[PDB]
């Protein structure tokens, strides 16, 4: 599923994940987009031949089971194409075990890149939630 900006905010407030650890909607709706353009179903290949699912790009080496990362963790406890259902659920839940796992949203790469320091509130802007 591809979700609209508002949709998905909806979503992910619905889910708890507004101000989660700390972090406004805002922020888990910018990582969305430049993560996954909003796609549930995006995958991305890693150089050390784990994978991101998803729409927030949860990886295989340490949180869920795709039967090829060779000696990874499922931290989850899912295998990783629950992280590809247009129902986000499986994707927040496993993405409020992350952002708590001392490094905050800063484990999303392109958070840290495009959405840190910069006015997240325009990802909610325009959005009844
Ligand atoms: C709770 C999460 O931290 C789990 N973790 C997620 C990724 N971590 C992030 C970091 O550690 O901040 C980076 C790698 N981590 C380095 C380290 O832990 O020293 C080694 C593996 N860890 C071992 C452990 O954590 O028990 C398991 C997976
Ligand atoms: C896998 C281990 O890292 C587990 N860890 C014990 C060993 N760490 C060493 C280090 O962090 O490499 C001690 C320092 N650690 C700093 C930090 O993590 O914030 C304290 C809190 N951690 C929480 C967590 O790790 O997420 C406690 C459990
Ligand atoms: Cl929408
Ligand atoms: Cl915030
Ligand atoms: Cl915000
Ligand atoms: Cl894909
Ligand atoms: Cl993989
Ligand atoms: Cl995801
Ligand atoms: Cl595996
Ligand atoms: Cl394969
Ligand atoms: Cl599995
Ligand atoms: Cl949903
Ligand atoms: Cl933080
Ligand atoms: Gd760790
Ligand atoms: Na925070
Ligand atoms: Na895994
Ligand atoms: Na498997
Ligand atoms: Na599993
Ligand atoms: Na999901």
């Known amino acids: 599923k591809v979700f609209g900006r508002c949709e998905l905010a909806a979503a992910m407030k619905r889910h708890g994940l507004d101000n989660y ?7 888990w709706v910018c990582a969305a987009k430049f993560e996954s353009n909003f796609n549930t179903q995006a995958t991305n290949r890693n150089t050390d031949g784990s994978t991101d699912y998803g729409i927030l790009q949860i990886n295989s080496r340490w949180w869920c089971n795709d039967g090829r990362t060779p000696g990874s963790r499922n931290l989850c406890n899912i295998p990783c194409s629950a992280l590809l259902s247009s ?18 949203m800063n484990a999303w790469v ?7 320091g ?12």
């Open 21 to 27: 650890r700390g972090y406004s909607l805002g922020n």
């Open 118 to 129: 910069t006015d997240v509130q325009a990802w909610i802007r325009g959005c009844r939630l």
């Open 87 to 104: 129902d986000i659920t499986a994707s927040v839940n496993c993405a409020k075990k992350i952002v708590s796992d001392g490094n905050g």
């Open 110 to 116: 392109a958070w840290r890149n495009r959405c840190k």
